[PDB]
Amino acid sequence: ETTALVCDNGSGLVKAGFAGDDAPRAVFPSIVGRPRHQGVMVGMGQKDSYVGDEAQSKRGILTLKYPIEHGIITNWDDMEKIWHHTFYNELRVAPEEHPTLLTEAPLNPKANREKMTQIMFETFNVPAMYVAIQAVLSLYASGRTTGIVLDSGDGVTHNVPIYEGYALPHAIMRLDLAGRDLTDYLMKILTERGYSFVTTAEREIVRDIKEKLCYVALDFENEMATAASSSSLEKSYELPDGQVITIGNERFRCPETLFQPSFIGMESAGIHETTYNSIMKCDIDIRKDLYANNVMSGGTTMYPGIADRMQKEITALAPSTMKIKIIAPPERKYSVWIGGSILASLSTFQQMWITKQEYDEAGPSIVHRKCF
Amino acid sequence: WXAXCPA
Amino acid sequence: ELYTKYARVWIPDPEEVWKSAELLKDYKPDKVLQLRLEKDLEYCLDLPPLRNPDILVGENDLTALSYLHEPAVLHNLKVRFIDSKLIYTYCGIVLVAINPYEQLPIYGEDIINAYSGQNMGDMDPHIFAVAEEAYKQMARDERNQSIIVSGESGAGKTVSAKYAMRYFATVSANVEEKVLASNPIMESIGNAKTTRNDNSSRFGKYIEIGFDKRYRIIGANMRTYLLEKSRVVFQAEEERNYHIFYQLCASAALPEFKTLRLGNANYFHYTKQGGSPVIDGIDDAKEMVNTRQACTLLGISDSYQMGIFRILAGILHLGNVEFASRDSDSCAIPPKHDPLTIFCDLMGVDYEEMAHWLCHRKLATATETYIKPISKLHAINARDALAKHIYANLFNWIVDHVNKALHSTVKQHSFIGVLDIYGFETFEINSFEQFCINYANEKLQQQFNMHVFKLEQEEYMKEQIPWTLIDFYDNQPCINLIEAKMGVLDLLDEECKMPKGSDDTWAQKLYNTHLNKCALFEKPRLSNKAFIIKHFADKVEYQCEGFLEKNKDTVYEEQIKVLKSSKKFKLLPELFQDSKEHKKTVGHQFRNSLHLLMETLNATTPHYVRCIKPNDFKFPFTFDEKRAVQQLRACGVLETIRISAAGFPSRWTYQEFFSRYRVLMKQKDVLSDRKQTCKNVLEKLILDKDKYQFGKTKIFFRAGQVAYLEKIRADKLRAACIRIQKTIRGWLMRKKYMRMRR
Amino acid sequence: FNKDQLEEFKEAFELFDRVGDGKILYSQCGDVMRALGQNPTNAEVLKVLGNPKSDELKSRRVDFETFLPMLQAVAKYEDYLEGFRVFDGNGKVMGAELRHVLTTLGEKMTEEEVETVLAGHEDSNGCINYEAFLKHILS
Ligand SMILES: Nc1ncnc2c1ncn2[C@@H]1O[C@H](COP(=O)(O)OP(=O)(O)NP(=O)(O)O)[C@@H](O)[C@H]1O
Ligand SMILES: Nc1ncnc2c1ncn2[C@@H]1O[C@H](COP(=O)(O)OP(=O)(O)O)[C@@H](O)[C@H]1O
Ligand SMILES: [Mg+2]
Ligand SMILES: [Mg+2]
Ligand SMILES: [Mg+2]
């Protein structure tokens, strides 16, 4: 018939597709490249700027901008290029024909929603749309109405507790630690072993090292004693030019900074202790159920061992008599999209859309009262 | 952001 | 007023839904009425329906009655059936047809020739009058024609269609035998024991008889609709599964079916749940022989028959695959599991490819795919959705083989098509099956009421009477309750997707959405698990408690793709041979199939038959006044009659009116113009034109008025008679006084 | 009624007295009224009798003097023709139809009464000249 688009801006990856699909079919990094060198050959078809996987391929000659930093859109002209690329090139669909559903992290500036709506209605002429909290969608994605969602992608981390479909807006926590800043730390520890990555093209190489080789130690201090006292832990990786690099304690040491942000220099406690401090802000009747369901979402939660490390130290913080249960499906990297896929295909949701009439009547302010 | 941070 | 001394009334009674009573003394506009029976009664109000004047009873037309209400209808059918032994009766357009449970001579070919090419009013109602009046429409209109048959299984529908076909063969072939030979297989696959009835047909069945430009029988196409797939996996108490599984289990001792390792009828989980494997009044062992014989008459090879029984025994074994929940989020199959071992041996699929895919589901993404586990509820749901998917494809394949047998090569110029469909349904407990069956009947009753309204508008133009007096009573609001978005089916499809959806939260969504927003949805006073819908026929109560586990089909493509791989035998991939549909629910597949049906009927101007089953024990030519009142409500005949009670049901030619009511005329009025004479007389007699319309050729009366005329006629006739007899008796007494003098 | 009328009526009354006590039964009262030229309906006769019960109508006896006020009270062409024209339009009436209606409707008479009054007035086809039959019964 007609089917809602569902789009997640994330940071790093964009992932997009149609409502009721099983998984997104547009997936590509939300990255905008411009050529920085002097162009010599006359007539090779050089563009002004490349987007997504095209910029990943040519990135040798490009500066790469990420237009979203910590879930805030910092650069709007380059964001419009990414949406334009998603609808026209990647999904090949005319945006007037389809309601769109868009995803955002909580506790971020309201100008971000005013602008994102103004652009959706006025340039695309999208007939109706909605903006949904990323954490909320992970429960739809996992078949629950109760839990505390710990969600971290690139950029923002946030915890949102939900008890039978009621949010608890006073107990929401947000942290800026996740995903990119892990990489910007890993470059400095690799520099300590005498490899130096100085440019945005090299950053993507480090990000792939992180994705292949990093893992979370169950006990950080014993494993640093192990790596210091042994070779066994040390693993070797091949750069795109066929050089080979060897990485020992650095590989576990990098995702450890999720649990001890002091390494990068933040004040706040790690994700375990903002999770616990989130649950403590909820009234005593429900903690029994929030401890019974903890849902991990987004790709920065996919380091091996992170689920165990969470369950172990929360079982250290919590009262001694309770199930602490961490629920981390292997699908979790896509959960916020799968949850939006479900939400957009409900029937009850069809009243919820902001429709173009109501924006014409009331202007971008309407988003705040209709949307969460 | 606009204040307490670079974005 | 309308009641007097010597008036008669119908009054409700235990033994028969109405009894006749007379007014022992005239009513006065008090709470008390003096009544005479058949004696003593005094009855009150807090009015009784009046009785029709006794010339009009048994007219072989129910709309000609001058009072139209349940006991007049029931009395007409009862007297025609018991006294006349006439079993067919016109009601408006409809042919009401009453199952005698007894043979009759009347179907012979001389009577066919008698009906042949005569219009319905010229001859007394008969099924041939319907077939004939389709045939002449197909010729005259150059438009296809339909016949529609409604009623409980056992009401005769199959035999009514049989004679409707024989009429065509005699006016215009091998089809009649070849089609008749289909019935045992399509019964065996498509009929079920149901709590009220055996052999309830659980699907719509549509035959198309093709004609050349010379309107001689080519051959027949067959189609099916609305199949009740949910029954394959789940039954309420005292129901069976589709017959074929029991006929197959009874066969299990025979030499071929040894290969299947069939057990007994209560060993398999899909047969066991009903409680009631054995129908007394049948033996299933025999019926298999009828089924195989009809297969062979339809040229399904002895190879394919054993294929079919392989697949069915597959399904029965599949249902016994018994997952152990191994974790909250994960389940498995306990090793070397015998039900699955036998299913694979039956099917050729590798044991471990199935054992893996039954318990895991797979996601595809750019550069990436995940196998992931599923919870035991989802495993059981997916298994059952596979069993339903196999069965529905098998049924469509068998129907497409019968169509190979019945097609004939010369192109169809136009066709007459005959629809056997189940009537409106109600039992003490009502569930998703009855919700589907009643929604379908609502769609058909809409299309009927639309067509009857059209025919009224035509007949009104034929007499040049303003349309304005007709109105169209429209069940459309109930359809927009059931099927439209934010409707009961739409919220049911929603509660499948929702996390921790349940019947208890589904009910609360119903009550929130509709409870006082719509006139037709009602909550039962003492319960929060049930809900009520006022259908056209009656108010009906449905339980929420089942619907969600019945509405959930979804099939994991991996398990189909495992079955498609198997090369032990050909039939198995042949079923699948022809992506969104794997994710549709049962309610949505039904709502689609019903649109395919309505798209078919809307093309093709229908004629209607209703079959009613007058007594419960199959006693020949007995009638029971409460059994029939049920089925005449469930067929919507009684609403249709109420709809015609609004409007002008009684229609008289001026000749007939003048002839009947000269006694009311006075000759000072009466003209050489009869029609003006009648106009003048009626203008004297009834003081409202509002109660009747004059037309070109007819007088249209509002419902009561003809009985009022019959009353005043009888009273005047009686007064004149009394004056004659008193005058004669006076003269005879003067003469007897002279005898006394002598 | 004058003395002469009262004497003639008493004489006629006494002719119907089959017991000699100078009385008739209530059930004979209507017959006497009709014998004296009145044409009351059975309903009118029972009404003027005071709606007697079966037992006193058949066995309670009254003399002429008590009967007389009732006769007085009861005593105190185009309609007859139209009444016959109800059953007509060639000026005839079936003998069978008149017989049926007189024996089955209204104050039903016996077949023998109807045969007696109809004797000689119907032709071979079984048709009654109702103007002649009416004049006959009014004579
Ligand atoms: N018009 C009819 N004339 C003679 N017998 C009839 C007629 N209608 C029904 N029957 C009897 O009905 C009995 C059982 O029903 P049947 O006629 O077989 O219909 P059916 O095959 O059961 N179709 P269904 O109503 O779906 O069950 C048969 O023995 C018939 O003799
Ligand atoms: N297998 C993996 N292991 C560890 N980190 C990963 C893995 N895959 C992706 N990442 C990191 O996760 C981040 C992306 O998370 P994602 O949920 O896609 O963010 P967003 O939701 O903002 O798009 C990237 O920084 C990427 O490097
Ligand atoms: Mg995210
Ligand atoms: Mg049948
Ligand atoms: Mg039958």
mmCIF file with all atom_site columns, C-alpha atoms in Angstrom, chain D:
data_model
loop_
_atom_site.group_PDB
_atom_site.id
_atom_site.type_symbol
_atom_site.label_atom_id
_atom_site.label_alt_id
_atom_site.label_comp_id
_atom_site.label_asym_id
_atom_site.label_entity_id
_atom_site.label_seq_id
_atom_site.pdbx_PDB_ins_code
_atom_site.Cartn_x
_atom_site.Cartn_y
_atom_site.Cartn_z
_atom_site.occupancy
_atom_site.B_iso_or_equiv
_atom_site.pdbx_formal_charge
_atom_site.auth_seq_id
_atom_site.auth_comp_id
_atom_site.auth_asym_id
_atom_site.auth_atom_id
_atom_site.pdbx_PDB_model_num
ATOM 1   C CA . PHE D 1 1   ? -101.600 -2.712  21.095  1.00 0.00 ? 1   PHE D CA 1
ATOM 2   C CA . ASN D 1 2   ? -105.370 -2.336  21.377  1.00 0.00 ? 2   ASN D CA 1
ATOM 3   C CA . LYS D 1 3   ? -107.729 -4.819  23.027  1.00 0.00 ? 3   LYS D CA 1
ATOM 4   C CA . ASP D 1 4   ? -108.430 -6.516  19.690  1.00 0.00 ? 4   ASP D CA 1
ATOM 5   C CA . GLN D 1 5   ? -104.709 -6.810  18.998  1.00 0.00 ? 5   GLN D CA 1
ATOM 6   C CA . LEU D 1 6   ? -104.099 -8.133  22.513  1.00 0.00 ? 6   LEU D CA 1
ATOM 7   C CA . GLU D 1 7   ? -106.844 -10.742 22.017  1.00 0.00 ? 7   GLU D CA 1
ATOM 8   C CA . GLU D 1 8   ? -105.495 -11.907 18.663  1.00 0.00 ? 8   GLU D CA 1
ATOM 9   C CA . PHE D 1 9   ? -101.986 -12.062 20.082  1.00 0.00 ? 9   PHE D CA 1
ATOM 10  C CA . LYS D 1 10  ? -103.162 -14.020 23.114  1.00 0.00 ? 10  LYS D CA 1
ATOM 11  C CA . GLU D 1 11  ? -105.045 -16.497 20.914  1.00 0.00 ? 11  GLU D CA 1
ATOM 12  C CA . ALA D 1 12  ? -101.949 -17.011 18.773  1.00 0.00 ? 12  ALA D CA 1
ATOM 13  C CA . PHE D 1 13  ? -99.844  -17.389 21.927  1.00 0.00 ? 13  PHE D CA 1
ATOM 14  C CA . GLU D 1 14  ? -102.231 -20.030 23.255  1.00 0.00 ? 14  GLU D CA 1
ATOM 15  C CA . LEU D 1 15  ? -102.000 -21.970 20.004  1.00 0.00 ? 15  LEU D CA 1
ATOM 16  C CA . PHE D 1 16  ? -98.269  -22.315 20.707  1.00 0.00 ? 16  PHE D CA 1
ATOM 17  C CA . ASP D 1 17  ? -98.959  -23.431 24.281  1.00 0.00 ? 17  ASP D CA 1
ATOM 18  C CA . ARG D 1 18  ? -98.358  -27.183 24.037  1.00 0.00 ? 18  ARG D CA 1
ATOM 19  C CA . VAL D 1 19  ? -98.872  -27.871 27.763  1.00 0.00 ? 19  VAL D CA 1
ATOM 20  C CA . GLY D 1 20  ? -102.158 -26.092 28.547  1.00 0.00 ? 20  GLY D CA 1
ATOM 21  C CA . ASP D 1 21  ? -100.867 -23.869 31.359  1.00 0.00 ? 21  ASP D CA 1
ATOM 22  C CA . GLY D 1 22  ? -101.306 -20.740 29.230  1.00 0.00 ? 22  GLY D CA 1
ATOM 23  C CA . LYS D 1 23  ? -97.549  -20.275 28.902  1.00 0.00 ? 23  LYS D CA 1
ATOM 24  C CA . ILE D 1 24  ? -94.713  -20.648 26.440  1.00 0.00 ? 24  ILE D CA 1
ATOM 25  C CA . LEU D 1 25  ? -91.034  -21.172 27.114  1.00 0.00 ? 25  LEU D CA 1
ATOM 26  C CA . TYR D 1 26  ? -88.528  -18.333 26.829  1.00 0.00 ? 26  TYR D CA 1
ATOM 27  C CA . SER D 1 27  ? -86.975  -20.255 23.932  1.00 0.00 ? 27  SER D CA 1
ATOM 28  C CA . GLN D 1 28  ? -90.311  -20.049 22.082  1.00 0.00 ? 28  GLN D CA 1
ATOM 29  C CA . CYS D 1 29  ? -90.591  -16.266 22.600  1.00 0.00 ? 29  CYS D CA 1
ATOM 30  C CA . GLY D 1 30  ? -88.507  -15.468 19.515  1.00 0.00 ? 30  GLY D CA 1
ATOM 31  C CA . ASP D 1 31  ? -90.585  -17.884 17.458  1.00 0.00 ? 31  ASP D CA 1
ATOM 32  C CA . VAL D 1 32  ? -93.761  -16.166 18.630  1.00 0.00 ? 32  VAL D CA 1
ATOM 33  C CA . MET D 1 33  ? -92.349  -12.718 17.831  1.00 0.00 ? 33  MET D CA 1
ATOM 34  C CA . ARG D 1 34  ? -91.494  -13.868 14.312  1.00 0.00 ? 34  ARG D CA 1
ATOM 35  C CA . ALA D 1 35  ? -94.900  -15.533 13.955  1.00 0.00 ? 35  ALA D CA 1
ATOM 36  C CA . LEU D 1 36  ? -96.475  -12.136 14.738  1.00 0.00 ? 36  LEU D CA 1
ATOM 37  C CA . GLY D 1 37  ? -94.568  -10.334 11.978  1.00 0.00 ? 37  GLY D CA 1
ATOM 38  C CA . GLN D 1 38  ? -91.388  -9.285  13.763  1.00 0.00 ? 38  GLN D CA 1
ATOM 39  C CA . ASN D 1 39  ? -87.980  -10.239 12.362  1.00 0.00 ? 39  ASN D CA 1
ATOM 40  C CA . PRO D 1 40  ? -85.647  -9.987  15.363  1.00 0.00 ? 40  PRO D CA 1
ATOM 41  C CA . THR D 1 41  ? -82.164  -11.411 15.360  1.00 0.00 ? 41  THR D CA 1
ATOM 42  C CA . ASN D 1 42  ? -81.300  -14.170 17.793  1.00 0.00 ? 42  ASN D CA 1
ATOM 43  C CA . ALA D 1 43  ? -79.156  -11.604 19.607  1.00 0.00 ? 43  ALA D CA 1
ATOM 44  C CA . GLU D 1 44  ? -82.089  -9.191  19.907  1.00 0.00 ? 44  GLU D CA 1
ATOM 45  C CA . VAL D 1 45  ? -84.334  -11.977 21.188  1.00 0.00 ? 45  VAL D CA 1
ATOM 46  C CA . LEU D 1 46  ? -81.841  -12.989 23.854  1.00 0.00 ? 46  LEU D CA 1
ATOM 47  C CA . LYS D 1 47  ? -81.314  -9.317  24.762  1.00 0.00 ? 47  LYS D CA 1
ATOM 48  C CA . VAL D 1 48  ? -85.032  -8.598  25.212  1.00 0.00 ? 48  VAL D CA 1
ATOM 49  C CA . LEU D 1 49  ? -85.246  -11.837 27.190  1.00 0.00 ? 49  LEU D CA 1
ATOM 50  C CA . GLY D 1 50  ? -82.611  -10.487 29.579  1.00 0.00 ? 50  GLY D CA 1
ATOM 51  C CA . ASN D 1 51  ? -79.789  -12.768 28.402  1.00 0.00 ? 51  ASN D CA 1
ATOM 52  C CA . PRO D 1 52  ? -81.333  -15.835 30.064  1.00 0.00 ? 52  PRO D CA 1
ATOM 53  C CA . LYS D 1 53  ? -79.205  -18.787 30.965  1.00 0.00 ? 53  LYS D CA 1
ATOM 54  C CA . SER D 1 54  ? -79.688  -22.010 29.006  1.00 0.00 ? 54  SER D CA 1
ATOM 55  C CA . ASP D 1 55  ? -81.706  -23.633 31.792  1.00 0.00 ? 55  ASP D CA 1
ATOM 56  C CA . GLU D 1 56  ? -84.311  -20.923 32.219  1.00 0.00 ? 56  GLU D CA 1
ATOM 57  C CA . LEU D 1 57  ? -84.415  -20.236 28.486  1.00 0.00 ? 57  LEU D CA 1
ATOM 58  C CA . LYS D 1 58  ? -85.346  -23.859 27.886  1.00 0.00 ? 58  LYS D CA 1
ATOM 59  C CA . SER D 1 59  ? -87.573  -24.608 30.884  1.00 0.00 ? 59  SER D CA 1
ATOM 60  C CA . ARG D 1 60  ? -88.679  -21.461 32.770  1.00 0.00 ? 60  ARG D CA 1
ATOM 61  C CA . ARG D 1 61  ? -92.239  -20.579 31.791  1.00 0.00 ? 61  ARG D CA 1
ATOM 62  C CA . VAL D 1 62  ? -93.885  -17.175 31.379  1.00 0.00 ? 62  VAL D CA 1
ATOM 63  C CA . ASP D 1 63  ? -97.498  -16.399 30.536  1.00 0.00 ? 63  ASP D CA 1
ATOM 64  C CA . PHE D 1 64  ? -98.693  -14.107 27.753  1.00 0.00 ? 64  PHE D CA 1
ATOM 65  C CA . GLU D 1 65  ? -98.828  -11.086 30.063  1.00 0.00 ? 65  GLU D CA 1
ATOM 66  C CA . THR D 1 66  ? -95.086  -11.170 30.773  1.00 0.00 ? 66  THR D CA 1
ATOM 67  C CA . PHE D 1 67  ? -94.191  -11.959 27.148  1.00 0.00 ? 67  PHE D CA 1
ATOM 68  C CA . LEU D 1 68  ? -96.189  -8.999  25.823  1.00 0.00 ? 68  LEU D CA 1
ATOM 69  C CA . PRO D 1 69  ? -93.874  -6.111  26.944  1.00 0.00 ? 69  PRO D CA 1
ATOM 70  C CA . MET D 1 70  ? -90.989  -7.948  25.257  1.00 0.00 ? 70  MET D CA 1
ATOM 71  C CA . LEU D 1 71  ? -92.893  -8.206  21.977  1.00 0.00 ? 71  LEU D CA 1
ATOM 72  C CA . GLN D 1 72  ? -93.723  -4.503  22.250  1.00 0.00 ? 72  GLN D CA 1
ATOM 73  C CA . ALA D 1 73  ? -90.085  -3.594  22.897  1.00 0.00 ? 73  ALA D CA 1
ATOM 74  C CA . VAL D 1 74  ? -88.859  -5.638  19.922  1.00 0.00 ? 74  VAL D CA 1
ATOM 75  C CA . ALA D 1 75  ? -91.549  -4.151  17.669  1.00 0.00 ? 75  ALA D CA 1
ATOM 76  C CA . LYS D 1 76  ? -90.523  -0.603  18.603  1.00 0.00 ? 76  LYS D CA 1
ATOM 77  C CA . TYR D 1 77  ? -86.531  -2.334  0.805   1.00 0.00 ? 77  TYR D CA 1
ATOM 78  C CA . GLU D 1 78  ? -83.458  -0.827  -0.843  1.00 0.00 ? 78  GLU D CA 1
ATOM 79  C CA . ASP D 1 79  ? -81.136  -2.100  1.886   1.00 0.00 ? 79  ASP D CA 1
ATOM 80  C CA . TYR D 1 80  ? -82.587  -5.600  1.571   1.00 0.00 ? 80  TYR D CA 1
ATOM 81  C CA . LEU D 1 81  ? -81.932  -5.425  -2.159  1.00 0.00 ? 81  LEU D CA 1
ATOM 82  C CA . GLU D 1 82  ? -78.361  -4.182  -1.786  1.00 0.00 ? 82  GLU D CA 1
ATOM 83  C CA . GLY D 1 83  ? -77.805  -6.926  0.775   1.00 0.00 ? 83  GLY D CA 1
ATOM 84  C CA . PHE D 1 84  ? -78.750  -9.423  -1.900  1.00 0.00 ? 84  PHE D CA 1
ATOM 85  C CA . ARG D 1 85  ? -76.706  -7.505  -4.495  1.00 0.00 ? 85  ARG D CA 1
ATOM 86  C CA . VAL D 1 86  ? -73.694  -8.216  -2.298  1.00 0.00 ? 86  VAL D CA 1
ATOM 87  C CA . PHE D 1 87  ? -73.820  -11.817 -3.533  1.00 0.00 ? 87  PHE D CA 1
ATOM 88  C CA . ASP D 1 88  ? -74.697  -11.009 -7.148  1.00 0.00 ? 88  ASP D CA 1
ATOM 89  C CA . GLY D 1 89  ? -74.048  -9.012  -12.108 1.00 0.00 ? 89  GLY D CA 1
ATOM 90  C CA . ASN D 1 90  ? -76.787  -10.792 -14.056 1.00 0.00 ? 90  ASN D CA 1
ATOM 91  C CA . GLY D 1 91  ? -79.446  -10.578 -11.335 1.00 0.00 ? 91  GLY D CA 1
ATOM 92  C CA . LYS D 1 92  ? -78.936  -14.146 -10.108 1.00 0.00 ? 92  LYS D CA 1
ATOM 93  C CA . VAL D 1 93  ? -77.450  -15.886 -7.074  1.00 0.00 ? 93  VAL D CA 1
ATOM 94  C CA . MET D 1 94  ? -76.119  -19.427 -6.895  1.00 0.00 ? 94  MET D CA 1
ATOM 95  C CA . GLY D 1 95  ? -78.322  -21.700 -4.835  1.00 0.00 ? 95  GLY D CA 1
ATOM 96  C CA . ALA D 1 96  ? -75.209  -23.415 -3.486  1.00 0.00 ? 96  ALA D CA 1
ATOM 97  C CA . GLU D 1 97  ? -73.611  -20.132 -2.417  1.00 0.00 ? 97  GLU D CA 1
ATOM 98  C CA . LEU D 1 98  ? -76.713  -18.802 -0.668  1.00 0.00 ? 98  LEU D CA 1
ATOM 99  C CA . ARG D 1 99  ? -77.090  -22.200 1.021   1.00 0.00 ? 99  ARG D CA 1
ATOM 100 C CA . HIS D 1 100 ? -73.475  -22.149 2.190   1.00 0.00 ? 100 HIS D CA 1
ATOM 101 C CA . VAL D 1 101 ? -73.571  -18.609 3.543   1.00 0.00 ? 101 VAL D CA 1
ATOM 102 C CA . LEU D 1 102 ? -76.924  -19.058 5.297   1.00 0.00 ? 102 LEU D CA 1
ATOM 103 C CA . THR D 1 103 ? -75.771  -22.306 6.917   1.00 0.00 ? 103 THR D CA 1
ATOM 104 C CA . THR D 1 104 ? -72.221  -21.166 7.747   1.00 0.00 ? 104 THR D CA 1
ATOM 105 C CA . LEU D 1 105 ? -72.163  -17.406 8.442   1.00 0.00 ? 105 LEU D CA 1
ATOM 106 C CA . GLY D 1 106 ? -74.059  -15.129 10.779  1.00 0.00 ? 106 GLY D CA 1
ATOM 107 C CA . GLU D 1 107 ? -76.899  -16.685 12.744  1.00 0.00 ? 107 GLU D CA 1
ATOM 108 C CA . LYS D 1 108 ? -76.419  -19.969 10.948  1.00 0.00 ? 108 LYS D CA 1
ATOM 109 C CA . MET D 1 109 ? -79.553  -21.809 9.879   1.00 0.00 ? 109 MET D CA 1
ATOM 110 C CA . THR D 1 110 ? -80.055  -25.493 9.168   1.00 0.00 ? 110 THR D CA 1
ATOM 111 C CA . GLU D 1 111 ? -79.879  -26.974 5.683   1.00 0.00 ? 111 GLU D CA 1
ATOM 112 C CA . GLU D 1 112 ? -83.553  -27.918 5.990   1.00 0.00 ? 112 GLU D CA 1
ATOM 113 C CA . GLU D 1 113 ? -84.673  -24.347 6.683   1.00 0.00 ? 113 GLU D CA 1
ATOM 114 C CA . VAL D 1 114 ? -82.627  -23.137 3.721   1.00 0.00 ? 114 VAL D CA 1
ATOM 115 C CA . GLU D 1 115 ? -84.008  -25.888 1.498   1.00 0.00 ? 115 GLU D CA 1
ATOM 116 C CA . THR D 1 116 ? -87.531  -24.971 2.579   1.00 0.00 ? 116 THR D CA 1
ATOM 117 C CA . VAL D 1 117 ? -87.212  -21.262 1.847   1.00 0.00 ? 117 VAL D CA 1
ATOM 118 C CA . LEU D 1 118 ? -85.244  -21.888 -1.369  1.00 0.00 ? 118 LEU D CA 1
ATOM 119 C CA . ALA D 1 119 ? -87.655  -24.520 -2.699  1.00 0.00 ? 119 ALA D CA 1
ATOM 120 C CA . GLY D 1 120 ? -89.000  -23.554 -6.119  1.00 0.00 ? 120 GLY D CA 1
ATOM 121 C CA . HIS D 1 121 ? -87.056  -20.300 -6.464  1.00 0.00 ? 121 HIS D CA 1
ATOM 122 C CA . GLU D 1 122 ? -83.845  -21.607 -8.080  1.00 0.00 ? 122 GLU D CA 1
ATOM 123 C CA . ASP D 1 123 ? -83.738  -22.716 -11.701 1.00 0.00 ? 123 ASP D CA 1
ATOM 124 C CA . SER D 1 124 ? -82.023  -25.684 -13.382 1.00 0.00 ? 124 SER D CA 1
ATOM 125 C CA . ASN D 1 125 ? -78.631  -23.958 -13.520 1.00 0.00 ? 125 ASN D CA 1
ATOM 126 C CA . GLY D 1 126 ? -78.885  -23.322 -9.789  1.00 0.00 ? 126 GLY D CA 1
ATOM 127 C CA . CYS D 1 127 ? -79.481  -19.578 -9.930  1.00 0.00 ? 127 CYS D CA 1
ATOM 128 C CA . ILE D 1 128 ? -81.813  -17.544 -7.732  1.00 0.00 ? 128 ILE D CA 1
ATOM 129 C CA . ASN D 1 129 ? -83.602  -14.419 -8.876  1.00 0.00 ? 129 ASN D CA 1
ATOM 130 C CA . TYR D 1 130 ? -82.897  -12.427 -5.745  1.00 0.00 ? 130 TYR D CA 1
ATOM 131 C CA . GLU D 1 131 ? -85.401  -9.656  -6.446  1.00 0.00 ? 131 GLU D CA 1
ATOM 132 C CA . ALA D 1 132 ? -88.165  -12.260 -6.704  1.00 0.00 ? 132 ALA D CA 1
ATOM 133 C CA . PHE D 1 133 ? -86.883  -14.287 -3.751  1.00 0.00 ? 133 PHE D CA 1
ATOM 134 C CA . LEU D 1 134 ? -86.628  -11.088 -1.716  1.00 0.00 ? 134 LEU D CA 1
ATOM 135 C CA . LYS D 1 135 ? -90.145  -9.964  -2.593  1.00 0.00 ? 135 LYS D CA 1
ATOM 136 C CA . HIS D 1 136 ? -91.297  -13.481 -1.701  1.00 0.00 ? 136 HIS D CA 1
ATOM 137 C CA . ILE D 1 137 ? -89.701  -13.437 1.745   1.00 0.00 ? 137 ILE D CA 1
ATOM 138 C CA . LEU D 1 138 ? -90.975  -9.886  2.347   1.00 0.00 ? 138 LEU D CA 1
ATOM 139 C CA . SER D 1 139 ? -94.569  -10.631 1.305   1.00 0.00 ? 139 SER D CA 1
#
